Specification:
It is classed as transferase. The entry lists the keywords transferase, methyltransferase, mycobacterium abscessus. Two copies of one chain form a homodimer. The first copy, chain A, has 212 residues and is α/β, with parallel strands linked by helices. In chain A, the strands form three sheets. In chain A, strands 2-1-6-5-7 form a five-stranded parallel beta sheet, with helices on one face. In chain A, α3 runs parallel beside α5 and α4 packs across α6. The longest helix of chain A has 19 residues. The two termini of chain A are 38 Å apart. The site of one S-adenosyl-L-homocysteine has 18 residues of chain A, from β5.
Chain lengths: 212, 217
């Protein structure tokens, strides 16, 4: 069983991934994804989740008192707290494999300039906390990051959801003047494997030379 | 104004585009996002979009005929065709800046093992095509990649408008016995700027040493 709790000021963002889960997996208790509106834990009539940054400058920072109450309710000692942030450690396939055997993931979705750092610092004194970036670009909020993380993790949980892969082909064998490489139709499966290995080598050199 | 068309066999998964700033920039009329069900271009009653690979291997490959018909209708020679794929060139902030000036993005979302390579090759004879990865992990489909790309681009379009950022803080100045760093309360702009620059470079060497030219863990 895995439980994923997502905390966000835009709970509707996560609803399609929630409905995408197969009923058989939910019934078997293999997975449970719950989404929580952060404003449940606000203190004031205006339901304030952000405030001006200390030290000045642009933007707003999400309030520690709101997030602290939210995580106090949702997390336990067993929780892995995931904090999406462009300033995080890289989220990779290795991370996804590690997290796919966790019992309880809580994803704290930030907005504006992010969450007051004391929230993560305090949480880290009683649970495991992981600040992660999903790539070398800037999003407006953590919800899209949460969707990526949930998909990448849950497709590694059975029954729920370095060279580059080369091109793939299906019917018809000729289409708009372009033929499927004839080796693929040859029935020489050792040669096909060598051909695919060379295609992967060339693609990796062209697109991802960092992978060598 | 920018037009973004997203083509997918799961158009409901794109409903989050209507949320937050993508939703607002849509509402503000700076960008129009249209989502298309790929199965509209099928002709059989089983509405088949996939078929087994040539040369063997597990899984299914998305058929070129259906994609070619869809892109024929949606794309023009001015279109920038975006094809999410874990085997793509990296999508980065620089890419987002470049695409923020485009008139027309079309995002072809794959499923199964991906789209027959000839779809991108054929499209590239008429238009610019970019196969891109959003990161070093594997998704089940291109729809989440589409949402990431749209978000990153739309916050840069004119009309809405290196190193890791260090920590941020807001009120109260002491919380659960944890204090905001006193320099941030001090009003000394030069000392605050110097502390923030130091925190940024310190976080970068710890979390992303590659950005400063050092070996990765
Ligand atoms: N590349 C990325 N990976 C993961 N989350 C990201 C992200 N880019 C933006 N976000 C999310 O969007 C929110 C707003 S970005 C705010 C943080 C600030 N821009 C910084 O540089 O640290 C973040 O708190 C995070 O939740
Ligand atoms: N890192 C990534 N970046 C962009 N798109 C991705 C992606 N990972 C998966 N996808 C999308 O998800 C689809 C299916 S993943 C393609 C099969 C893959 N070789 C595998 O290991 O199973 C892709 O066609 C692409 O649209
Ligand atoms: Mg942040
Ligand atoms: Mg995965
Ligand atoms: Mg790649
Ligand atoms: Mg694709």
């Amino acid at each position: 069983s895995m439980k994923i709790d997502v905390v966000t000021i835009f709970p509707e963002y996560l609803q399609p991934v929630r409905q995408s889960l197969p009923g058989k997996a939910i019934d078997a208790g293999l997975v449970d994804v719950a989404v929580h509106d952060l404003r449940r834990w606000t203190h004031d009539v205006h339901k304030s989740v952000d405030d001006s940054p200390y030290g000045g400058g642009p933007g707003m920072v999400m309030k520690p008192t709101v997030w602290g109450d939210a995580l106090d309710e949702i997390c336990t000692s067993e929780t892995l707290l995931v904090v999406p942030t462009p300033a995080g450690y890289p989220f990779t396939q290795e991370t996804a494999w590690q997290w796919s055997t966790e019992d309880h993931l809580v994803i704290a979705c930030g907005r504006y300039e992010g969450i007051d750092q004391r929230v993560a610092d305090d949480a880290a004194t009683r649970m495991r906390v992981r600040e992660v970036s999903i790539g070398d670009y800037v999003l407006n909020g953590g919800e899209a990051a949460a969707l990526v993380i949930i998909e990448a993790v849950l497709r590694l949980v059975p029954g729920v959801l370095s060279l580059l892969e080369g091109p793939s082909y299906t019917r018809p064998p000729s289409w708009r003047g372009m033929d499927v490489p004839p080796v693929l139709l040859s029935g020489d499966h050792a040669k096909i494997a060598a051909w695919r290995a060379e295609q992967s080598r060339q693609r990796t050199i062209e697109r991802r030379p960092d992978l060598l």
